[PDB]
């Protein structure tokens, strides 16, 4: 019956207030478009969700709630939501540099870039975890950059909320290659699931693809809780291999917090400013052009 659902959104037709432009990517329940707020003229990202198609409605509601409860320069900003029949327009912050996955397209990343990106992801994780929120879908595709090199976490479509009522989660959610073993087994889990997913993302930043990409997603789901954790192989520095090993511990009790990882040798070795990442944005622009 969706009682109280429409009350939370502006019933004003979003085509009058916003000018919809080109598609820039996709989200958990819809397509992401570039837009301009007709009043301020300011650039925005618009996510259009078909409620009849994604009828997943509890999760759409979860993403709305999560985004409106976050207030951090490390989390994509939310500007409201507009309903137009079965379509829901979610207006968010515009990040012109695209994703960390988009940025791997022209070629491999030097270690200096990887350490800077991981440091900024950790600042985002530290904020979420302090707010008792778990992202649950940490991967390069969900790490976005502004045209100035600011790194932000996006896509709260499967995000979890811990309380004094619910100390742990048990929901089976995420993308197979990046999923923590306790998530797959549906054991009671917390913020430590994002730490494991960050370790998979660290390998993905170094290799362009997560570990065991040569395997079928369903085979990987069956093997993650049974096999030894992945390792960073090949020509990479010892502190980088150590950072990955710290994240990829099968026992969550031994995985460090985001705050601890911000003190890791791999993260502290390089002291690049986020503006350093604009070179990757320029490289991607030259490659696409």
Angle subtended at Cα 65 by Cα 62 and Cα 60, rounded to the nearest 5 degrees: 35
**Exposed (0-12), middle (13-18) or buried (19+): which is 224, by Cβ within 10 Å?**
buried
> Closest distance between ligand J60 and the C-beta of residue 262, in Å?
24
Is residue 35 part of an annotated ligand binding site?
Answer: no
Instruction: Measure the CA–CA gap between 168 and 161, rounded to whole angstroms.
Output: 9
Q: Which of 24, 54, 173, 221 binds ligand J60 (CB under 6 A)?
A: 24
Tell me whether residue 50 is one of the annotated catalytic residues.
Answer: no
Q: What is the dihedral of CA 203, 125, 247, 162, to 10 degrees?
A: -130
Nearer to ligand J60 (CB atom), residue 144 or residue 244? 144
Beta 87-93 vs 43-50: how paired, if at all?
Answer: antiparallel
Catalytic site residue from 126, 137, 155, 194: 137
Helix (H) or strand (E) holding 224: none
Segment lying near ligand J60 (by CB under 6 A), choices 96-104, 111-119, 217-225, 274-282 = 96-104
Q: CA-based Rg of the chain, rounded to a whole angstrom? A: 19
Q: Which of 49, 64, 74, 93 binds ligand J60 (CB under 6 A)?
A: 93
CA 125 to chain centre: 10
Residue 138 near ligand J60 by CB under 6 A: no
Q: Which of 66, 92, 115, 220 binds ligand J60 (CB under 6 A)?
A: 92
Residue 63 near ligand J60 by CB under 6 A: no
List the binding residues for ATP.
24-32, 47
In the complex, which residues of this chain contact ligand J60 (CB under 6 A)?
24-25, 27, 32, 45, 76, 92-96, 98-99, 102, 144, 154-155
Active-site residue numbers? 137
């Amino acid at each position: 019956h969706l009682r109280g659902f429409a009350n939370q959104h502006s019933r004003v037709d979003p085509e009058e207030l916003f000018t919809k432009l080109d598609r820039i990517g996709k989200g958990s329940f819809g397509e992401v478009y570039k837009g301009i707020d007709n009043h301020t003229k300011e650039v925005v990202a618009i996510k259009i969700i078909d409620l009849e198609e994604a009828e997943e409605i509890e999760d759409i509601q979860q993403e709305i709630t999560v985004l409106s409860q976050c207030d951090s320069p490390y989390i994509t900003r939310y500007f409201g939501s507009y309903l137009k029949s079965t379509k829901l327009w979610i207006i968010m912050e515009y990040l012109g540099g695209g994703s960390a996955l988009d940025l791997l397209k022209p070629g491999p990343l030097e270690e200096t870039y990887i350490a800077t990106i991981l440091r900024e992801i950790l600042k985002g994780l530290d904020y979420l975890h302090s707010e008792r929120k778990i992202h649950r879908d940490i991967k390069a595709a969900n790490v976005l950059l502004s045209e100035q090199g600011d790194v932000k976490l996006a896509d709260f479509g499967v995000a979890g909320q811990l309380t004094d009522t619910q100390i742990k989660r048990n929901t089976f959610v995420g993308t197979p290659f990046w999923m923590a073993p306790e998530v797959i087994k549906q054991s009671a889990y917390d913020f430590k699931a994002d730490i494991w997913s960050l370790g998979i993302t660290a390998i993905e930043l170094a290799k362009g693809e997560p570990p065991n990409s040569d395997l079928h997603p369903m085979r990987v789901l069956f093997l993650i809780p049974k096999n030894s954790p992945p390792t960073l192989e090949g020509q990479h520095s010892k502190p980088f291999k150590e950072f990955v090993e710290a994240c990829l511990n099968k026992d969550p009790r031994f995985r460090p917090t985001a705050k601890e990882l911000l003190k890791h040798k791999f993260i502290t070795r390089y002291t690049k400013k986020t503006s350093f990442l604009t070179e990757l944005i320029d490289r991607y622009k030259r490659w696409k052009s």
